[PDB]
């Protein structure tokens, strides 16, 4: 239905230009380019349909970590027969946790460069908004459709806002909102590796989640993203300065050499102030 809006709005834009005292009304490329700007796809805070992924050498370093991520989203797609000949279940889930700065999206969306399918994600506002029914029923169309609409990658974040107090030793007393830790566990054994499914869990506190999420058989592959060292922090400053008119005569290593406890956010903090006074020179 959105493809019908792209052709009908460009023709309506063209007749808003051609109007004075019906001779030639060929729809131009700029009318379709303007229709891409002012309009939008069907993602009006619904299930998100996008494939925003970055290529390689966009996170600095990774020369010893890139071989650890190529065996979870490429090899089940490129060679599926290696699991069917042996009989093993492929690990479709990898838990991610690391230092501040990076870790949420750019360390997970740079892994799936070869698939580039639709990414249906849960996030902050996708929580218990309705007090009845719409707590795990908004997740039931994510679990059952992942094997029906394969390939579809589902990202999982904000682990301290879903199962923090409910899965603990004290739990929930009263049956008010204890309906969150059940469907996250009973949909694990009921799902097999028949179709292309993939889940990624990422958080800032790995011990704040229930230990039944880390049950064997589903999270047998634990990959830890570490802090970028001195050999990787210099290439971070060459990665987030991509679309910039950067003079190559300077040394970006001397900025990164004074960063020991400073993560990629502080590398983003030290480079944002360099762009504030750069436009002020033009002012």
């Amino acid at each position: 239905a959105d493809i019908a809006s792209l052709c009908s709005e460009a023709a309506m834009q063209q007749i808003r230009e051609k109007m004075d005292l019906l001779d030639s009304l060929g729809v131009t490329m700029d009318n379709f380019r303007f229709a891409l700007g002012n309009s939008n796809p069907s993602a009006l805070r619904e299930t998100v349909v996008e494939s925003v992924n970055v290529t390689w050498d966009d996170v600095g370093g990774l020369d010893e970590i890139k071989e650890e991520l190529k065996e979870t989203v490429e090899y089940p797609v490129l060679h599926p027969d290696q699991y069917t000949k042996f009989g093993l279940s492929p690990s479709k889930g990898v838990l991610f946790y690391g230092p501040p700065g990076t870790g949420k999206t750019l360390l997970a969306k740079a892994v799936a460069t070869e698939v580039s399918a639709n990414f249906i994600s849960v996030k902050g506002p996708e929580l218990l908004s309705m007090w009845y029914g719409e707590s795990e029923s908004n997740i039931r169309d994510i679990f059952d459709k992942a094997r029906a609409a394969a390939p579809t990658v589902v990202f999982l974040d904000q682990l301290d806002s879903i199962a923090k107090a409910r899965g603990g030793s004290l739990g929930d007393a009263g049956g008010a909102s204890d309906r969150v830790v059940n469907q996250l566990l009973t949909e694990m054994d009921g799902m097999n590796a028949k179709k292309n499914v993939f889940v990624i869990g990422a958080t800032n506190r790995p011990d704040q989640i229930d230990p039944a999420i880390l049950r064997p058989g589903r999270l047998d592959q634990l990959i830890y993203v570490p802090l970028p060292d001195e050999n990787a922090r210099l290439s971070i400053l060459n990665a987030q300065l991509r679309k910039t008119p950067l003079e190559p005569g300077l040394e970006l290593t001397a900025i990164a050499k004074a960063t020991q406890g400073f993560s990629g956010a502080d590398l983003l903090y030290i480079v944002q102030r360099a762009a504030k006074y750069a436009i002020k020179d033009s002012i």
Binding site: Y132, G174, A176
Partner: protein, 48 residues
């Protein structure tokens, strides 16, 4: 030192509005309604 919060939900109504059984209408036809003042209704006789 904690709380318990729970909301509610309701369903209002549906209706059909079914009435007028046939035995009430057959009694409804055979009656009178009244006649102003001098609007007699008559009798008649014949066929000796």
């Amino acid at each position: 030192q904690i709380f318990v919060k729970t909301l509610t939900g309701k369903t209002i109504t549906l209706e059909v509005e079914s009435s007028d059984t046939i035995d009430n209408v057959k009694s409804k036809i055979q009656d009178k309604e009244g006649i102003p003042p001098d609007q007699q209704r008559l009798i008649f006789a014949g066929k000796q």
